[PDB]
Design a protein around this ligand. Structure first.
Ligand code: SAH
Ligand code: 7JD
Ligand code: CL
Ligand code: MG
Length: 213
């Protein structure tokens, strides 16, 4: 079996069904004591929780699901009837994420879309009945962050106040995306310095709030 399958099985055997916080703790314990994995983790996750609670977004888009850690982390703090869509290119990972959300009791709040972000984004309005997004979590692949931000804008999915939250802007790093948002009048940017998941290595989140054309 794969690392991701082992993480899910660990959850299943060391967390409580229906209890999101127990799911996060189990994933964090496994990835600290057994095998590292690229979940946003607890240090950055606490900054993410702070953001979610500030904005209480009704519709969140996540780019990059992996095993579902971040989807559990966000979806557990959404208000009733609020929703998360998450896009995942790797079908094995999509199936793990679904099972993770199911285990957590969050499946009614989350839709996992199996496909590439750049193919799915153009289908959100007509196929997923989306108007505009309240928040975007970018956490898929460093080289897609800029192109997919620009695509989201093109497709009319951002509105004044939409919150872009970007993982890994330091490690692996996303220099094109950062230089672009920081230098654009269309974005109000703040940097949240932290650590790479499970590691004593500096990393951070970028918050970029869309301000209109
Ligand atoms: N273009 C793309 N579209 C969708 N998913 C992508 C993608 N490029 C990479 N990915 C997916 O992005 C994920 C990065 S890891 C995501 C971690 C997750 N947000 C968490 O914190 O728990 C991987 O599962 C990878 O398959
Ligand atoms: O590719 C990644 N996508 C999404 N999130 C990531 C993430 O949080 C960490 C890393 C990562 C960081 C250091 C390293 F040595 C190897 C991989 C990659 C991704
Ligand atoms: Cl951590
Ligand atoms: Mg990440």
């Amino acid at each position: 079996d794969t690392k991701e399958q082992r993480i899910l099985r660990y959850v299943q055997q060391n967390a409580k069904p229906g209890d999101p916080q127990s799911v996060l703790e189990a994933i964090d314990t496994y990835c600290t004591q057994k095998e590292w994995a690229m979940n946003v983790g607890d240090a950055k996750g606490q900054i993410m929780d702070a953001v979610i609670r500030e904005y209480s977004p009704s519709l969140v888009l996540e780019l990059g699901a992996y095993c579902g850690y971040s989807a559990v982390r966000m979806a557990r703090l959404l208000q009733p009837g609020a929703r998360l869509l998450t896009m995942e290119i790797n079908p094995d990972c999509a199936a793990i994420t679904q099972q993770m959300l199911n285990f957590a009791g969050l499946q009614d709040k989350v839709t996992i879309l199996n496909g590439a972000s750049q193919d799915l984004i153009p289908q959100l309005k007509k196929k997923y009945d989306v108007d505009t997004l309240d928040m975007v979590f970018l956490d898929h692949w460093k080289d897609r962050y800029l192109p997919d931000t620009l695509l989201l804008e093109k497709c009319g999915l951002l509105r004044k106040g939409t919150v872009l939250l970007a993982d890994n802007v330091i490690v692996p790093g996303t220099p094109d995306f950062l230089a672009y948002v920081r230098g654009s009048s269309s974005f109000e940017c703040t940097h949240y310095s932290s650590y790479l998941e499970y590691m004593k290595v500096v990393d951070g989140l970028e918050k970029a709030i869309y301000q209109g054309p």
